[PDB]
A paper describes a structure:
In this work we have determined the structure of [name], a S. typhimurium SPI-2 T3SS effector protein that inhibits the NF-κB signaling pathway. In this work we determined the structure of [name] and showed that it is a hydrolase with a papain-like fold and a catalytic triad composed of Cys-73, His-162, and Asp-182. Structurally, [name] can be classified as belonging to the CA clan of cysteine proteases that contains papain and related proteases (MEROPS peptidase database). Although [name] is highly conserved among different serovars of [name], serovars Typhimurium and Enteritidis differ in containing an arginine or glycine, respectively, at residue 161 near the active site.
Interestingly, conversion of the [name] sequence to that of the Enteritidis strains increased the activity observed in the DUB-GloTM protease assay. To explain why the Gly-161 polymorphism leads to greater activity, we crystallized an inactive (C73A) form of the variant in the presence of RLRGG-AML substrate. Although density for the RLRGG-AML substrate was not observed, we were able to build additional loops (two of them near the active site) that were disordered in the previously obtained SpvD4CS/R161 structure. To map a potential ligand binding site on [name], we superimposed the catalytic triad with that of the UCH-L3 ubiquitin hydrolase crystallized in complex with ubiquitin. The position of the superimposed five C-terminal amino acids of ubiquitin (RLRGG) is unobstructed in the SpvD4CS/[name]/C73A variant (right), whereas in SpvD4CS/R161, binding would be impeded by the side chain of Arg-161, which restricts access to the active site (left). Modeling of the RLRGG DUB-GloTM substrate onto the Arg-161 or Gly-161 structures provides a rationale for this observation, clearly showing that the side chain at position 161 forms part of the active site groove and that an arginine side chain here restricts access to the catalytic triad. When compared with the Typhimurium SpvDA154/R161 variant, [name] with a single polymorphism (Gly-161) was more potent in (i) the DUB-GloTM protease assay, (ii) inhibition of the NF-κB luciferase assay in PMA-stimulated cells, and (iii) virulence in mice. Furthermore, we demonstrate that a natural [name] polymorphism significantly affects virulence and NF-κB inhibition in PMA-stimulated cells, leading us to hypothesize that the substrate hydrolyzed by SpvDG161 might be part of a signaling pathway involving protein kinase C.
Author numbering: 8 to 213
The structure:
């Protein structure tokens, strides 16, 4: 599947209004294809921390862009391998659309949920999907995430359902961009939102 990403990134069939965005992705993205030991089928919380650390290969003093980081991490989780990572030096906020990122990484726009009104409701929706279909990995899009200095802004992050021995499955939120706290608790991540709340969930399906 990594070779498909390479084919799409380099293709000539791109509207030149998108070519700058695609060049930004190309410059940021690294693809490690060497055959290595996979992560386990049943992921641990520790596995998620290692995966989140891997995707964010930005230079010191650069933050990268959450839309690209979250897509990379989602892709890696899906394949149970550290394949994609970002060294993006471009803006954390502007110049990357989730639609273009999804087309590049996954080969299509991912289907988004209906809008959810709180991170609590996100958690419940994800647990519902896990209960019914055992869907366990998602990209979360938030409309009014409070980022340092800039304030309310769109933000993408991840969530994975972790199933530990003899414990109820729980949602682990993962924010590979927020390197101060890459595995926030619900309570912690809620601090970054006021009531101005809108969230969407999406996931890659093969
Ligand atoms: Cl910014
Ligand atoms: Na950095
Ligand atoms: Na935090």
């Amino acid at each position: 599947s990594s070779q498909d990403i390479i084919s799409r990134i380099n293709s000539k069939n791109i509207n030149n209004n998108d070519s700058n965005e695609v060049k930004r992705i190309k410059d940021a993205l690294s693809i490690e294809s060497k055959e290595r030991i996979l992560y386990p089928q049943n992921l641990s919380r520790d596995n998620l921390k290692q995966m989140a650390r891997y995707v964010n290969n930005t230079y010191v003093h650069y933050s990268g862009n959450a839309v690209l980081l979250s897509a990379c991490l989602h892709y890696n989780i899906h394949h149970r391998q550290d394949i994609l990572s970002s060294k993006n030096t471009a803006s954390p906020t502007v110049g990357l659309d989730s639609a273009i990122v999804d087309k590049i990484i996954f080969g299509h726009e991912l289907n988004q949920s209906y809008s959810l009104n709180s991170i609590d409701e996100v958690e419940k929706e994800i647990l519902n999907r896990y209960d019914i279909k055992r869907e366990s990995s998602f990209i979360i899009s938030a409309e009014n995430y409070i980022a340092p200095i800039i304030g309310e802004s769109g933000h993408d992050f991840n969530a994975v359902v972790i199933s530990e021995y003899d414990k109820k499955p729980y949602v682990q939120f993962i924010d590979s961009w927020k390197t101060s706290n890459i595995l926030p608790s619900l309570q912690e991540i809620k601090k970054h939102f006021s009531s101005s709340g809108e969230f969407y969930v999406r996931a890659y399906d093969e």
